[PDB]
Each structure stands twice: as C-alpha cells, then as structure tokens.
C-alpha cells in the first residue's frame, strides 16, 4: 500500500483571450515539485526533486512537459470553438496523474480529468475514456483526441515505465524526509455549549508527522464516547494539526484527560489533565478580552 | 518564415535525379508532407512522414525526414517533364484534427529536354 | 470519394467591390479552410470552420468574412476589393478524425481591374 504519487494540474480559461495552468505534485502528503503559470521551468520544493534521473533525463521530461502545457492550453482553446453552443467559457480542468507504490517492485498508475469540478475521463490502456456520468458532448472530442496515436504512446510511457520508474527513485532519494517523526504538542482550552449549562472541552494537538494519530479523552481508563475528532489540518512546516471536543455538564471537567498516541512518542502517550498544574499556568498566559 | 525550402529554383536535365529541401522550426511536428502544384492548379499530395526518422516513396517520388534535425528531403527519380510545377513542404503541429498547418514558400523545379 | 470544389475559376472585380467564392466538398469533411496563396510566400489561413454555421479567424482574417452554410460547402467573401490587386485563394477541407486526410481546390484566381 503506503506511497501514492500525484501531479496535479489545473487549468483555468476564462475567455478567448485569458488562460493559466499551474501544477503542484506530491509523494504522500509532502509536496516535492511546483510549477506555475510564470514560470518556464518546474521548480524542486525538496532537495532530493531530481530523484534518480541525471540532469539529462530531467530536463528531457522537462522539455516534454514544457511543451506540452503550451499546446495543451491551445488545444483547449479549439475544443471550445469545436463545442460552440454546447460548451462556454470559463472552463475549469484538473488533472490527477499518479503513480500508486505496491511493495516493491509493483504500481498502479492513473490519469483522470476533470471538467468544471466533476470526473469525467481518464486514460485507460491506450486511450482516453469518459467515465460514467460524463456528458454525452464530450465524446466528439475524446474521438478527435484518440486519433492522435503520437501522444497516447509517450502517454502510455509515461504512466507504464516512467512514473513507476521515477517514484522508486523519489523513495531511496528523499527517505529521510519522508519517515521523519515530528512529536505533537498538546493543549486544552474550553468554550460554552449550545446546551445551556453545558461546556464544550477541546484537546488541541498541533506539530506531528506522520499523519496518523490517536486522540481521546478519558476519564480514568475509561474512553468517553462523546468524543468527536476534528479533520486533520496542514501546519506551514509540513505538520498537522487535529483537536478532539467533548461536551459535559459544567463541572464534570474535573477529572478528565486528554490522551494522544503517536509514532514519535513510540510508548509514552501525552496525558494532560484538566485542571492540572500546567493547565492552569498555560491557561493563564493565554486570557484575553472574547 | 517557420518551414524553409531551398533552392527557391530549380533546374535539372530530364532524366536526371533532383533533390529539394524542407527545414523547420515548428514544434511540435506531428508530421511533414510534401505537395505538388501546378501552375493555375491545387495541390496534390506527394508523401506524408510521420516518424521521428521515416521514409516514404510514393511512386516516383520518395522523401525522407529527420525529426531530430527539424530536416527533410524529397526525391524525384528519373524525372520528366511534368514535374516541373512547384513542390510544398509543409508540417502539422498536430496529431489531431485541432492542429494547424505550416507552410512553405516553396522550389520551382524547371525540367529541361 | 470526392472532390472538392472551388467556384469561380476565375474572378474579376473592381476596386471597393464584395466577391464570393464557394467550396463544394463531398468527403463528408467537417473542417473546412480558406488559405490565400502569395506567391514566394506561402500559405495563410483566412477563416477556417467546424461546421454549420461556424467560422474562426484565420491569421489572415480581416478585410474579408466567411459563412458556413452547410457541412457540404463553405464561402469566402472579400468585403473590398483592392486597385490592382490579383490573388489566389484555396479552398481545402479537413477529416476531424485524420489529420492527414486533407484535400485541396483547384483556386480560384482574382484579378481587380479599375
């Protein structure tokens, strides 16, 4: 299972005259390339970007994706003429391109497209195909694309031999980075229920890496159900950042914990007690005037 | 401006075996074709190359194209005097019908008896 | 199957006149072209077409229109016609599903006398 590779493309079109596409791609959650409509060339966003390919192969894709982007964004320009009624600017399109890792050696790779937010093709086998639920408009211009055999074969070489190939490279290349261990830092802070008389507790984790943690309160030894985790949340620093809220009578607070579990700690779980001598000192310094 | 085609004339003995050149500098170049016009006449289409390096022959005429030098030849053998009229070097950008065609000026071939 | 044909053969105009021209394809051709030939230059596109009635410009556009009518045939206008100005113009049409199936008019030849 573990890493999915992923280049994102998304492509805007406002009008005849107004277009930009930008990129960003990421191996997991960490994002190891970014290409923008200004820029000429991609740009590393990690150290170990180039993974196993020489400078040589690397821009020989590079050359490849430059072109690309420039007649892509024409190519478009035409469909629309070639839709006339049937499709208007703006016009919306993304682009998920990935390579999957199974345990080595063995992938999975994909493309999908989407058209003003909603899945309509991919590329399967050696050619494109609408999805289920696609506009029956769009068929005309999967034909006039399928024609083109040139790019569905560098296609094909990319999403078969390359992606794989470039990604295992990705894996020795920046190992480092990617089984880093980030310890979470917790605190506990409180707000008034819905429930009238009622208090709304909240555990804050912030700062760990890898994504997978585990958050509860306890009374005791005992998992109290009401407990309902947040979603994830990105840090700037590439760290995440989750809160669990529980909500009880006014002062049944005492005596609960917040509890966390996480690859960094390996056996020592944080415990953090309300009302405890910490609680009490960091509430202390973070008062202020609601 | 974007395809070039040397010599702008041509002359050659009838009989004898010409050579005219396309050059370019389109991208992308899906493919490179050569055509035919007669004076107060259309276009006719010569040979069409496809690969990255290819040859075709259409009859008497053959024509070779090396995509890796944005460069292409075309062969008339045992030429006759029908063969004067003026020969197209053109190339397509694309693989698909959204593609566009570039042309070139063109070589004059003038066969003489 | 086909052919394509342009009409007039030949034209004849004065300065500040509009002349028309049609191409008449039978190839089942969705795209159609109208390309001017001058001469040591090569070809221009003028307006180009994917159907009925549509019609994009080509780099070579202005001073004339263009009108789908029908899949089958596509006209060229010359809004106004210049003082000593002879021309050539093509017709050529297009498969959307073969790039490679392209085919040519004979041309049509214009000569503006005052």
């Known amino acids: 299972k573990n890493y999915t590779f992923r280049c994102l493309q998304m492509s805007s079109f406002a009008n005849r005259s107004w277009s930009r596409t930008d990129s960003v791609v990421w191996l997991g959650d960490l994002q190891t390339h970014r290409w923008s409509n200004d820029s000429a060339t991609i740009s590393f966003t990690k150290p170990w970007s180039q993974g196993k390919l020489s400078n040589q192969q690397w821009e020989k894709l590079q050359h490849m994706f430059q072109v690309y982007r420039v007649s892509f964004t024409r190519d478009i320009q035409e469909l629309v003429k070639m839709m006339s009624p049937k499709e208007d600017y703006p016009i919306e399109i993304q682009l998920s391109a990935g390579c999957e890792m199974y345990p080595g050696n063995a992938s999975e790779s994909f493309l999908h497209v989407a058209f003003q937010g909603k899945y309509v093709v991919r590329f399967w086998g050696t050619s494109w195909q609408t999805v289920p639920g696609a506009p029956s408009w769009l068929d005309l211009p999967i034909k006039v694309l399928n024609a083109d055999q040139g790019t569905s074969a560098t296609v094909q070489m990319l999403l078969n031999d390359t992606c794989p190939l470039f990604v295992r490279g990705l894996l020795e290349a920046g190992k480092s980075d990617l089984e880093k261990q980030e310890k979470p830092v917790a605190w506990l802070s409180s707000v008034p229920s819905s429930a009238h008389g009622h208090r709304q507790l909240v555990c804050h984790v912030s700062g760990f890496y890898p994504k997978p943690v585990w958050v509860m309160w306890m009374r005791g030894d005992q998992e109290q159900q009401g407990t309902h985790r947040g979603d994830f949340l990105p840090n700037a620093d590439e760290t995440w950042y989750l809160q669990a809220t529980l909500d009880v009578e006014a002062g049944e607070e005492a005596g609960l914990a917040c509890r966390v579990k996480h690859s960094s700690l390996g056996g020592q779980d944080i415990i953090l007690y309300w009302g405890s001598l910490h609680h009490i000192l960091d509430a202390q310094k973070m008062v202020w005037n609601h | 401006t974007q395809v070039e085609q040397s010599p702008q004339s041509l002359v050659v003995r009838q009989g004898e075996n010409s050579v005219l050149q396309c050059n370019y500098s389109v991208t992308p170049d899906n493919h490179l074709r050569w055509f035919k016009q007669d004076t107060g006449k259309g276009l006719v289409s010569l040979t069409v190359l496809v690969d990255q390096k290819d040859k075709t022959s259409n009859g008497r005429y053959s024509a070779t194209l090396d995509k890796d030098a944005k460069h292409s030849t075309l062969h008339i053998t045992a030429t006759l005097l029908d063969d004067t009229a003026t020969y197209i070097c053109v190339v397509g950008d694309r693989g698909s019908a959204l593609g566009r065609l570039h042309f070139g000026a063109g070589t004059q071939l003038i066969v003489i008896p | 199957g086909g052919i394509i044909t342009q009409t007039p053969k030949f034209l004849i105009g004065q300065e500040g006149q509009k002349l028309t021209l049609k191409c008449q394809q039978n190839?089942?051709?969705?795209?159609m072209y109208w390309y001017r030939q001058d001469s040591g230059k090569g070809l221009r596109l003028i307006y180009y077409?994917?159907?009925?009635?549509?019609?994009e410009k080509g780099d070579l556009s202005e001073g004339y229109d263009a009108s789908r009518e029908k899949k089958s045939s596509f006209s060229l206008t010359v809004t106004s016609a210049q003082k000593n100005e002879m021309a050539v113009f093509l017709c050529?049409?297009?498969?959307?599903?073969?790039?490679?199936?392209?085919?040519f008019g004979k041309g049509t030849r214009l000569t503006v006398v005052e």
């Open positions: 077409s994917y159907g009925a009635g549509s019609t």
């Open positions: 050529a049409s297009g498969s959307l599903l073969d790039v490679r199936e392209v085919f």
């Open positions: 190839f089942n051709h969705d795209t």
